[model samples]
Target: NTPREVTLHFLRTAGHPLTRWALQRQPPSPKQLEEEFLKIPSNFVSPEDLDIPGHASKDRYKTILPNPQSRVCLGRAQSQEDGDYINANYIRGYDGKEKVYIATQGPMPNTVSDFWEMVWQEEVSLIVMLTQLRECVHYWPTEEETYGPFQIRIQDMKECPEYTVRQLTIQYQEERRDVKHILFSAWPDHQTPESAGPLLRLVAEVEESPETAAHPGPIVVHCSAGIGRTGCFIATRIGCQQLKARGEVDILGIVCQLRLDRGGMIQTAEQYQFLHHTLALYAGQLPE
Candidate 1:
């Protein structure tokens, strides 16, 4: 029921009755998405509200305080020893898939141990870091090193055009697990990536990786504050899946769902617009 011009801009039409109804009810345009993004308040959680005693002090601006329902709980031993709290949440994936992601903040020097502990306890296998070391302190070990009780050894390292990939072997008290770490360094703080191609390529690469499927734990994704760029990355991945399966995408719906789980998913209007552009470009590449 939309105008020809509006329909033409999108690569696919909503196939299912529900999807079509949603689209007809509230079709999303780039301008409209931007406006909606801007209308969302940024300060959803305050610093004092999240300031827990015995938690790392450096996470004033970078941590995510999960809503009571979706917070990730550590194992009993780990929980009791370190107060059992991390600034992370279990983000649902496309179509309400549960525990698809553990969206968290970039690790601070003080919380490095807590970060590794979460990874170990959660059994997370894939970590997608969106910022450079300059943006936050380096939490991952270099070569064979130990952080807290975990000993990490780098098995391999590869540099892609947009990101770097590292295979890390993590060990704790005779138990060992291999993890893949992807550092996407092209994104700037408070802004979108220069182009969607590289970001999409990274998405494709991660999706195509056998390790991702083989591992059962959620993919841990992080940026500076784990909201702005973090939200964009997670939203785009979910959006792509929805687009491919339903022949349509609900970016606003996805963002709303994300905020429901973790407060802020896509941070700014510009970033929201960039997500639409990215999806449009990605959709255009699909074959007829």
Candidate 2:
């Protein structure tokens, strides 16, 4: 059977019992969650009192790649020193001296509130939303109340089935432009590279926009816990970039590096194999 067909069949046929059993085997503990938080040392101000304690091992590492040659800041969560109802964890970037900030709805409102405060402290000029946990649209006004007159961009993958992009405006204000939201649907197991191609194209185009002329900023991506499907998206993007640069790079190596860096980043052996097949499909080769 074709790999994609087999994958779809497996997911469709895997009953609740199998799914539950799979989940039970690897439930993330609070300690494990804390360990992930600690990996990004610069994201938090004082790690000592957070009650989260863990050393970096093979399991936890930086979520995004650090750019050593350039002066670009990646992502951060909201914290004290910038008081608001809650912290709004932000992803910041720059165009010459101007800044771009993006925030996501977190478990608490402060999680986002505090993030924007940090963005202002850094003089951010623009903001974008990557994922919508909940309260996607409403989260902006709360931000505008603090950081006035900043541009807000949304890449909503949920609720907005159309994935339409909207500019952050005054609470209840009408939008002035037709902002485009990129849609990325879930791919059945076998679809691999074909499934991921459009997403790569969409993101590449976003980075190439005029506003991003000087510094495109890090593409801030997240999917629950910043792992799993999120990692797959990242790995696929990296694999695409490598192919563009060198014309070839080990696709398995990309998945393995993710797994090694963040304990089972792709999460299953089957998914790993699918990544190889997907890359092969893109290259017009049979899976080895």
Candidate 3:
């Protein structure tokens, strides 16, 4: 959450080697970055760590549970003890802004209702769905469907070259709110995506929707386990903002912030480097 200049100043004052690497104009090599990633502890949370017994049923992956401090609790909704836990966390954006994003796992078999409860409670108007791995209850319905107390209606499904956008209206009790849903399938199945254009375009599309997120509840983002690809998208977003505002980017700093919020963010070293490429393109340091 510290300002980039101040963050760098402290590192320089302490004579941290990272500041020297950052001082250099060139980004670190993949091997160098991977070694850095290894040093950052995962700090993963276990189901036993929290008293929530049914948490296993809610989380898409038992090991990827949100950190106790950062996990979003479902307090205002109708639910019991362990029911209050939703496998989601508040992700900070540039300068540690809290209302930036909420990163969570894809809707699981038993957690669809809890998912909407958080969205409705948070007043989230923008949802970015990365990879659809499982066939649980779908978040976006073709027409309309009720999941527990909330009703989701699809207004329009626009097809894009790299992704698909859906206009959604979610109704809860007496109030109704609109949410934008974007499914980005451009991420490759194997290694990292070679090109970063679609990712930047997706980030641009999310940013352009100022009207939708005006109340500016965290922009909800999810992938299967909610840590791997989800982390990449978020880091790219924060990094782009920093790159545009300040000339050079501090991707390592951004990734560390994200991991502190939720363990295992920016999951792979390959994905980690992809973030550099994405920001490089946005900064005009790399050829399209």
Candidate 4:
């Protein structure tokens, strides 16, 4: 049979016609168009960004994290950054040598399962989750080794009995009293500086606390693409710490230093602007 005859037979059995390449494309149905639109955000922006990429130019979506000088070798279950490092998506813990944690604004990947499985074998102390990533702790880490199994929800700030802000403030104080440094998770979807008020206040509180300052440690921030939310959280926290100390506004310089350390640190112009706004809001200034 001819190719067209075979094609027609298949189309007829499938109950649809294959359009000729020369023909104009058919308009998509509403549902199909919605699905396509949803995919655009995922395609254009990392899962971490709060809104569609259209709100920010491509140049603004850059990440500013340092190149993995040593790749996270999955097969060997080794981290090049440190020998005893524990891997939690957006939580914080220590490896005995250095206090480590991550602040992120994105989804966790399946590959992380393998990494955590390796981490469970180490001499880690605790893993705390601020949201859905708690599933990682439940799967491998034991009750004895695991800490509070604490979870932080965006709504918890507004809905919890004690008030979200107060609850978060308490959580931060508890961490300040307990661990050397705690990892905070910030998603662009859930954490702008204003949205992350409680956590930011915690960082500020920790800096002010003589007990915390004696052992000042870094907070590891990350997102799916490891650039946007992570950088902004770090920038905002550091900026706030500086402002509280110096009583001056140096956010532009602070963010620049962060970008020097990590590519696309701010990820989007909107995020950068929000960071500035966060600092300004904390300082009680309107956007100029």
Estimate the Cα RMSD of every predicted model relative to the unseen true structure: 7.4, 14.5, 5.3, 18.5
Q: Each candidate's TM vs. the true structure?
A: 0.83, 0.44, 0.86, 0.42
Candidate 3 lDDT trough over 10 residues, lowest sum:
12-21
Q: Could you tell me the lDDT of residue 177 within candidate 3?
A: 86
Residue 162 local lDDT, model 3: 77
lDDT of 3 at 160: 92
Clashes of 2: 16
What is the number of backbone collisions in each predicted candidate, taken in the order shown? Answer: 0, 16, 0, 15
Off by over 4 Å in 3: 1-25, 78-82, 132-137, 188-190, 212-214, 285-288
Clash list (residue pairs), candidate 3: none
Expressed as tens digits, the lDDT of each residue in 95-197 for candidate 2 is 1122232222222232343334434334433333334333122444423253333244443323434233443322113422223333244433222334435
How many clashing pairs in candidate 1? 0
Supply the TM-score for candidate 1.
0.83
- Candidate 2 residue runs with Cα over 4 Å from true position: 1-108, 117-138, 141-162, 168-194, 197-207, 211-216, 256-264, 281-288
- Candidate 3, residue 105: the lDDT equals 88
Q: Across residues 1-288, which tens digit of lDDT does each residue of candidate 1 receive?
A: 554334322223222222433443445766766666765543255456654575546354644465546777666454346556677889999888999999888877777887888898888889999975445777777878897788999999999889899999889888899899999986887899989999899898779755643548888999888888889999889888887787688776677677766876777788887887788777766656
Worst 10 residues of 4 by lDDT: 15-24
**Could you give the candidate ranking by lDDT, starting with the highest?**
3, 1, 4, 2
Q: Flag regions of model 1 displaced more than 4 Å.
A: 1-30, 41-43, 46-52, 56-58, 62-64, 76-80, 132-134, 212-215
